[PDB]
């Protein structure tokens, strides 16, 4: 099941029962997750800006007839924290590491909570979510998200898609450490099923290996 807005700039694809992938075009696509829980909707990453973020939120709240209660910000770039102003005015908790919170302020964005530690486990209803900071890579602050009940890993921009031959913006990246950080993710999660890249189609652990290949 895939749902889109009339313009086609926002789509939501179902991965499983309560897990969907949201994609917005900035055209340049960016992925995130929508988790449908018994106590509201939880998103992994917002969108490019406040307009798209508001649209995304309105779209999912209308579909599931629930409130978006929390959002996990994976790093301080527009495709992830672009709609932070929209989140705060709607009472949506914007979770992030302390580092992401300070880099956000530095990039002219309002500040997220800065509550996430290196390993943080959250439970929304019956939905379990684990956030993990593997080290510097695409950015100094990038984190990954793990759904242990499904063995689904949200790689974010730390992971490139199968067709990608470019690492993207590396002005804020730590290219040399990036490989070590991906290795930390591989060592931590031994049995991965699906892997969601920052941009592109959902794949498997092969995407992490592919990214390591690009980094060589
Ligand atoms: Zn980025
Ligand atoms: Zn990216």
Swiss-Prot record:
NCBIfam families on file: bla_Bc_2 (NF033095), bla_class_B_core (NF012229), bla_subclass_B1 (NF033088)
UniProt protein name: Metallo-beta-lactamase type 2
Q: Which gene encodes it?
A: blm
> What is written in the cofactor note of this entry?
Binds 2 Zn(2+) ions per subunit. The enzyme can also function with only 1 Zn(2+) ion.
Q: Does the keyword Oxidoreductase apply?
A: no
Quote the catalytic activity from the record. Answer: a beta-lactam + H2O = a substituted beta-amino acid
Origin species: Bacillus cereus
List residues traversing the bilayer: none
What GO MF annotations does this protein's record show?
beta-lactamase activity; zinc ion binding
